[PDB]
Design a protein around this ligand. Structure first.
Ligand SMILES: *[C@@H]1O[C@H](CO)[C@@H](O)[C@H](O)[C@H]1NC(C)=O
Ligand SMILES: *[C@@H]1O[C@H](CO)[C@@H](O)[C@H](O)[C@H]1NC(C)=O
Ligand SMILES: *[C@@H]1O[C@H](CO)[C@@H](O)[C@H](O)[C@H]1NC(C)=O
Ligand SMILES: *[C@@H]1O[C@H](CO)[C@@H](O)[C@H](O)[C@H]1NC(C)=O
Ligand SMILES: *[C@@H]1O[C@H](CO)[C@@H](O)[C@H](O)[C@H]1NC(C)=O
Ligand SMILES: *[C@@H]1O[C@H](CO)[C@@H](O)[C@H](O)[C@H]1NC(C)=O
Ligand SMILES: *[C@@H]1O[C@H](CO)[C@@H](O)[C@H](O)[C@H]1NC(C)=O
Ligand SMILES: *[C@@H]1O[C@H](CO)[C@@H](O)[C@H](O)[C@H]1NC(C)=O
Ligand SMILES: *[C@@H]1O[C@H](CO)[C@@H](O)[C@H](O)[C@H]1NC(C)=O
Ligand SMILES: *[C@@H]1O[C@H](CO)[C@@H](O)[C@H](O)[C@H]1NC(C)=O
Lengths: 228, 208, 342
């Protein structure tokens, strides 16, 4: 029974190199090529290249040319992948694969029936940045017959995660904290909002409490209606 | 080209999922399933052939350049993300997630102008909240002085609420303080099945 | 009426029973004498489908060449499977001879004679023969040596050009001599000389054929990306010695798109510690024979793999292929297929 075992996950800084292994068993290692596909959330699965164990022949994906190396060890039937000049964009889960059809005489590489369990690799700076917290003020007039939405914008922090509570956790009903988004700057931002009776807007006080462990940052911010 | 649609399917167990791939070049296409925290798995190869272990609830079809994976009677182990493959290339993926049926609810739309605290930074973020709606399918478009915006906005959606089975969406438009001060009318337009018409919430910069 | 079939071919040759040479010795005991007056029957109003990539004749030849090499080029020390075999390794007389492959009773070889046939597809000019032409079992990598030339234009061959894992075989219509030498008086060091004018002109013609198959994209050549020396270098056997030649200069895009006109000299080395293409492992052979070791050969083809990758650029990149020596036999056996009568 064909099995593909990979090496453990790792964390890396930008500029580093990485190497992961894939030990194959259950079949004649020489006869079929081995592929490396990487998966990253919100991105198309990316074929990085194949490697034929017999003579170590390789075909690297054009967009990775010069940064990637595929070797193998015949005796221990293990394939190896190496990636240089890592960036944030290299943060993904790395798989080794091999096609379904393989004989001593013939193969089709691409119907990937067999996958390794996957090696997750994270590339990020050790730098940490605290969040800016901006208030999302309710509105102008108090509508004594409806409800008001308010919140705070937790912007430009790195890395994940931030957390948001309201009134030190006493306020939870109608609260919505959205999953963070990754901006072009490389930094994260999320929104937290809470819907409340409008009549309470000039009576009850609303504080959003932002926690960002990596930067050792705890910020309290009062969201209040604009005066004009 | 290999274009996979749709991006997200929100379905209840029992319903059927219809995922499609449009391709520029004919040839053997495969479909892969990926359950959360697990390595992908070959489902269909050579267009319509079912891989070993795959029940006949999965089936492949092709009309012209359109290859389709349908999955009848969704079970728990059928949810996850699906990809199409042709040679070394893959589709963007289709996320098939569990949806709990409930009655249609139009969103409540709120819009938040930039903080005076933020404007001192040099950036301007306009936030548009779509609150407690169902189904998940919802379109947002930003308009500034009635001009459609592209590529200066990011969205975010919450998990289906465990109590009322609704979703909430937050979109954020980001402009420089300079670019921002150049325009007056900022608006987010929301189309949702719960609405008779696309609802637009807007404010005029400078006035309260 | 017939049908495609697979049988055990026999082989024929013009081997000399007196010759001490290795290919001749093998052929004497494995083959029969060639037919002086062969018989070719051109079939009119007959269209037949050919596939060089699923032609089992290739498999049988491969078995024979592995046989021949094991029974001849025995290493002094065999290192395979964690064990060590120590044999005797006498220096041998080595020069490949043409081997004909032929069908038994009940079976016939169909031959394609379309001057632009690419290996796969239907054929109009089909003839019926008992034996293939004489094929020299020249084991090589990157460059196909001493083979047959294409009649008309340069022919690109591939089981699928869109599959970057399938080998591309370039078939030349004009040979380019390669002159490899290990002089007399480092004894392992050697070199090969190519006419730069002829080569860059053939290579220029090859870039123009590949453009016909790849939407007029910029064709670019490059050295191999990796692998053992047996594929990152032109690997071949001359007079018994194992040669490894560096073809980096051979794939010079500069002389394709001035001063390049001259004699290209590729740096070579003869190795004694090699990896067996048989697929076994690593072997140790004796030091090279003393004196000038030389062989002049026809480059008659190139093996290429195309760079894959989810890029969007308007240019393709090719690199000298090799490894599967079965492909070497495909390049000569492509116009043949075995059928059984009824
Ligand atoms: C090329 O590959 C496709 C599938 O990818 C296959 O259907 C077709 O037959 C192949 N072409 C040849 C000439 O074998
Ligand atoms: C087949 O043979 C005929 C007769 O000689 C010739 O005219 C024709 O060009 C040949 N076809 C090909 C494809 O070479
Ligand atoms: C060879 O010709 C056949 C049919 O004439 C065609 O289908 C195939 O793509 C061709 N192959 C190459 C490598 O040109
Ligand atoms: C090399 O080519 C020349 C002319 O093309 C030919 O005369 C000679 O027989 C060839 N050598 C071989 C096939 O070994
Ligand atoms: C070889 O083929 C090329 C086209 O690829 C052509 O330009 C050249 O004239 C041919 N050489 C011959 C027929 O001797
Ligand atoms: C091959 O090159 C050698 C020099 O390395 C030269 O002496 C010899 O004459 C050449 N042979 C041919 C056939 O050109
Ligand atoms: C290379 O070949 C050309 C003919 O194509 C010939 O004129 C020239 O003399 C050759 N160069 C050398 C160095 O022999
Ligand atoms: C081949 O020679 C070139 C000469 O520039 C060199 O860069 C390259 O490393 C050599 N290749 C091998 C495999 O030694
Ligand atoms: C290609 O030819 C040019 C022109 O002579 C030369 O400068 C360059 O070094 C060559 N590249 C090689 C041999 O890799
Ligand atoms: C090619 O043939 C020539 C003469 O026919 C011979 O001297 C040479 O050794 C051969 N080359 C190879 C690589 O077998």
């Amino acid at each position: 029974q064909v099995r593909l075992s990979q090496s453990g996950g790792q964390m890396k800084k930008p500029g580093d190199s990485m190497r992961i292994s894939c030990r194959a068993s259950g079949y004649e290692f020489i006869n079929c090529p081995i592929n490396w596909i990487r998966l990253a959330p919100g991105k198309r699965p990316e074929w990085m290249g194949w490697m034929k164990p017999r003579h170590g022949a390789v075909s690297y994906a054009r967009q990775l040319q010069g940064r990637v190396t595929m070797t193998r060890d015949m005796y221990s039937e293990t394939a190896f992948l190496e990636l240089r000049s890592l960036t944030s964009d290299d943060t993904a889960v790395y798989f080794c694969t091999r096609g379904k059809y393989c004989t001593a005489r013939d193969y089709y590489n691409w119907d990937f029936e067999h996958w390794g369990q996957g090696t997750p690799v994270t590339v990020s700076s050790a730098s940490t940045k605290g969040p800016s917290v901006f208030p999302l003020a309710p509105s102008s007039k108090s509508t004594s017959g409806g409800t008001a939405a308010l919140g705070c914008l937790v912007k430009d922090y790195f890395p994940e995660p931030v957390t948001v509570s309201w009134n030190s956790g006493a306020l939870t009903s109608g609260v919505h904290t959205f999953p963070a988004v990754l901006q072009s700057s490389g930094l994260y931002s999320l929104s937290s909002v809470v819907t409340v009776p409008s009549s309470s807007l000039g009576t009850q006080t609303y504080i959003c409490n932002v926690n960002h462990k990596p930067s050792n940052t705890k910020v309290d911010k009062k969201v209040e209606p604009k005066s004009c | 080209v290999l274009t996979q649609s749709p991006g997200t399917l929100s379905l209840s167990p029992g319903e059927t999922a219809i995922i499609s791939c449009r391709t520029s070049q004919y040839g053997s296409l495969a479909w892969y399933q990926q359950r959360p925290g697990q390595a992908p798995r070959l489902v269909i190869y050579s267009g319509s052939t079912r891989a070993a272990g795959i029940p006949d609830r999965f089936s492949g079809s092709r009309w012209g350049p359109d290859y389709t994976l349908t999955i009848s009677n969704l079970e728990s182990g059928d949810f996850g993300v699906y990809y199409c493959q042709q040679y070394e290339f893959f589709g963007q993926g289709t996320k098939v997630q569990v949806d709990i049926k409930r009655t249609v609810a139009a969103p409540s739309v709120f819009i938040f102008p930039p903080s005076d605290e933020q404007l001192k930074s040099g950036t301007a973020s306009v936030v548009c909240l779509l609150n407690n709606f169902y189904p998940r399918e919802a379109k947002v478009q930003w308009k500034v002085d009635n001009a459609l915006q592209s590529g200066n906005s990011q969205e975010s959606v919450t998990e289906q609420d465990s109590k009322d089975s609704t979703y909430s969406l937050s979109s954020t438009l980001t402009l420089s303080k300079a670019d921002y001060e150049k325009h007056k009318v900022y608006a987010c337009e929301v189309t949702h099945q719960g609405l008779r018409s696309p609802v637009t919430k807007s404010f005029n910069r400078g006035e309260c | 009426v017939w049908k495609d079939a697979d049988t055990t071919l026999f082989c024929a040759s013009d081997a000399k029973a007196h010759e001490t040479e290795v290919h001749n010795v093998w052929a004497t005991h494995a083959c029969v004498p060639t037919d002086p007056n062969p018989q070719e029957i051109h079939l009119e109003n007959v269209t037949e489908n050919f596939n060089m990539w699923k032609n089992n004749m290739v498999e049988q030849m491969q078995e024979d060449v592995i046989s021949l090499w094991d029974q001849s080029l025995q290493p002094c020390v065999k290192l395979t499977g964690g064990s060590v075999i120590k044999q005797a390794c006498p220096k041998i007389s080595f020069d490949p001879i043409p081997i004909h492959y032929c069908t038994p009773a009940g079976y016939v070889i169909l031959k394609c004679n379309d001057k632009n046939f690419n290996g796969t597809g239907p054929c109009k000019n089909v003839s019926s023969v008992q034996c293939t032409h004489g094929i020299k079992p020249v084991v090589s990598t990157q460059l196909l040596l001493n083979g047959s030339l294409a009649e008309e234009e340069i022919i690109i061959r591939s089981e699928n050009l869109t599959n970057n894992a399938k080998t591309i075989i370039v078939h030349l219509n004009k040979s380019v001599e390669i002159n490899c030498t290990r002089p007399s008086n480092d004894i392992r060091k050697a070199y090969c000389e190519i006419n730069g004018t002829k080569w860059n002109k053939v290579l220029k013609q090859v870039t123009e054929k590949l453009k016909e198959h790849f939407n007029n994209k910029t064709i670019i050549f490059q050295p191999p990306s990796g692998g053992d020396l047996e594929i990152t270098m032109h690997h071949f056997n001359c007079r018994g010695e194992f040669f490894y030649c560096n073809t980096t200069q051979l794939f010079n895009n500069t002389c394709i798109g001035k001063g390049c006109n001259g004699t290209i000299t590729l740096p070579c080395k003869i190795k004694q510690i090699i990896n067996m293409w048989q697929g076994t492992g690593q072997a140790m052979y004796a030091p090279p024979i003393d004196g000038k070791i030389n062989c002049v050969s026809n480059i008659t083809g190139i093996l290429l793999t195309r760079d894959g990758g989810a890029n969007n650029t308007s240019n393709e990149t090719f690199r000298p292929g090799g490894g599967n020596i079965k492909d070497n036999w495909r390049s000569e056996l492509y116009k043949y297929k075995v059928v059984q009568i009824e």
